[PDB]
C-alpha cells in the first residue's frame, strides 16, 4: 500500500524520461538539417561578395 504506488511514480517518470530523450534527439536532428542548409546559402553569399573584391579591385585600380 506504500511501495506498490511508489513504483508507479517511478515508471511514469521513466516513461516521461525515455520519451523526452527521444524528442531532444528529434529537435537535435532538425537542427543539423537547418544548419547545413542555412550554412551552404551563406558560403555562396560569401563567394558572391568575394568575387566583387576581385572585381572592384580591377575597377578601382584603374
Amino acid at each position: 500500500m506504500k511501495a506498490e504506488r511508489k513504483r508507479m511514480r517511478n515508471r511514469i517518470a521513466a516513461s516521461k524520461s525515455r520519451k523526452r530523450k527521444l524528442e531532444r534527439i528529434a529537435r537535435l536532428e532538425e537542427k543539423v538539417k537547418t544548419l547545413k542548409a542555412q550554412n551552404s546559402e551563406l558560403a555562396s553569399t560569401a563567394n558572391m561578395l568575394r568575387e566583387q573584391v576581385a572585381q572592384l579591385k580591377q575597377k578601382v585600380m584603374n
Binding site: E29, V32, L35, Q38, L42, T45, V60
Partner: protein
C-alpha cells in the same frame, strides 16, 4: 540453455547501446561544428559587406 541466452542478449543490448550513444555523440559534435561554421560565415559576410561598401563608395564612386 536459458542462462546463456540471457547472458548473450544482455551483452548485445550493451553492444547496441554503446553504438547508439556514439552516434548521438557523433551527431552533437557535428551539430557544434555547423553552428560554429555557421558562425564564421555570418561574420565573414559582415567583414566583406563592409569591405565592399568601404572599398566601393570611397575609392571609385
Amino acid at each position: 540453455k536459458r542462462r546463456k541466452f540471457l547472458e548473450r542478449n544482455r551483452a548485445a543490448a550493451s553492444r547496441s547501446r554503446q553504438k547508439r550513444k556514439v552516434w548521438v555523440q557523433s551527431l552533437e559534435k557535428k551539430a557544434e561544428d555547423l553552428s560554429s561554421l555557421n558562425g564564421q560565415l555570418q561574420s565573414e559576410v559582415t567583414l566583406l559587406r563592409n569591405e565592399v561598401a568601404q572599398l566601393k563608395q570611397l575609392l571609385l564612386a
